[PDB]
Every structure is written in C-alpha cells, then in structure tokens.
Amino acid sequence: ILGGREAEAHARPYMASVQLNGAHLCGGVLVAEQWVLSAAHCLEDAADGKVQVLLGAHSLSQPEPSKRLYDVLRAVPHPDSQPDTIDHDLLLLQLSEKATLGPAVRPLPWQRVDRDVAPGTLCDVAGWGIVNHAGRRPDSLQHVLLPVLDRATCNRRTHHDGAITERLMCAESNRRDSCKGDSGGPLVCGGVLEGVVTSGSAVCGNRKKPGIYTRVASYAAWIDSVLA
C-alpha cells in the first residue's frame, strides 16, 4: 500500500494474509467462517508450495494472541481466470477448519447485488504490500481510503485503454494505490466488500494507471456456488 498509513491493529478482522511457504504472498478477505477470497494470480505461480492463510494478524512477524495460521483444504481459482489476463481474477481458499471468531477475526459482508459502486465513493483498501517504489515491505497492516473512479474515465486511452469490463472497477491511484503484495486484498465500501485487488500493474501510484479491482458482486453466483 502506497500513500496510506498503518491500520488500527485488528480493526479489520476480515483481513487475511495469504502465505506461500510461510511468507506473505497476497492479501485476502474472510467472507465465510471457512472461506477466504483472494486473487487467482496469487496462486498462478505457487505450484508445489505450501499455501496457508494467516488470520487475526496485524504484524506479519510479531507475537499476537489472535494470530492463527490455517492450512488450506482447497484452492479454487475462478475456472475462467488465466495467467495472461486480468479477467475473472478470483480465488477462494477453504480453511482447514472454520475460523475461530472474535474481536480480531470476523467475516465481512460482501455485495451480492450486481450494481456498480458509485463513482466518488470513498473505499478502504488494506494490505501488507510494498509501501514505496524502493520496494520496502511493511511488517504491519496498512490501509488507504481511495475514491472510486468512473469506469468510463478509467477506460480512457491514457489510462487502461478499454480493458476495464463491467466486471471490473477502478479507484484513483495518485500517490495512493495498492501495490505488489496487495493483490487479492479487499476494497471495502461502507463496511461491505465490493472489490478484490487485481494484477499488479508495472508502476504503483501512477495517476494515469488507476487501481483495478475485481467486482465481487459480478461473481456472486460463482462465489455462492463454491461456498454451497
């Protein structure tokens, strides 16, 4: 997260760290007691690796009473996701057991009705991704409030040049943005999950390249089917 601040510890009890061989790989969001939603490209590399989910964390490294590392019983990338595209970039991870809930671990409601978030709406993005261009990784959860950008403008040639489908949304990315290691993390509006961070684009915090997020409401049928 570039241009943000350290989040209040455990104030986002839905926040998950998707880990590969004990190292933070992607953000994720607890959407049911036993299920974490993230981005498919997070796994599109993992292969042999041991995939786990850390819940209840603020610091990735430091002792905390609420921290709990879960194995994953199944990893379900969206069947239409593809390594060379930003489309359908969702990943559901089933935890080895239902998460132990408490003040620091709680699923977040997610939008099932397929309607766009209104342009200008301020939404919260959280994660442990890099916080500057030098690529330094923060140890504790960061977050930033970003205004939603109208899809039309986001699709302008200088921006994303027609790549933003009705299944995607954008947020402004000027000095503030999600970055490498923030992929899979949640875009939350008024306490509701609306978006998941998609593929890291080559430059973080570039105003001509708005952040791109997968619209969870657009994939509600798919999500529901997996969870059922």
Numbering used by the authors: 1 to 228
Publication text:
Human factor D (FD) is a self-inhibited thrombin-like serine proteinase that is critical for amplification of the complement immune response. FD is a single-domain serine protease that has a unique physiological substrate. It converts the surface-bound alternative pathway pro-convertase C3bB into the active convertase C3bBb. A salt bridge between Arg202 (Arg218) on the self-inhibitory loop and Asp177 (Asp189) locks the S1 pocket and rigidifies the exosite.
The R202A (R218A) mutation disrupts a crucial interaction responsible for maintaining the self-inhibited state of FD. The previously reported crystal structure of FD R202A determined at 2.8 Å resolution showed the catalytic site in an active configuration with residual density indicating the presence of disorder, which could not be modelled. In addition, these data yielded weak electron density for a number of surface-exposed loops, suggesting high mobility and/or multiple conformations for these regions. The new map allowed a more detailed interpretation of the active site, showing multiple conformations that indicate the coexistence of both active and inactive configurations. Despite the overall improvement in electron density, however, the surface-exposed regions corresponding to the exosite loops remained poorly defined, with only few interpretable side chains. The R202A FD variant has enhanced activity towards artificial peptides and simultaneously displays active and inactive conformations of the active site. Partially active conformations of the catalytic site in FD R202A (R218A) versus completely inactive conformations for the wild type are consistent with the observed increase in the catalytic activity of FD R202A (R218A) towards artificial peptide substrates. Biophysical analyses using thermal shift assays and circular-dichroism spectroscopy showed very similar results for wild-type and R202A (R218A) FD.
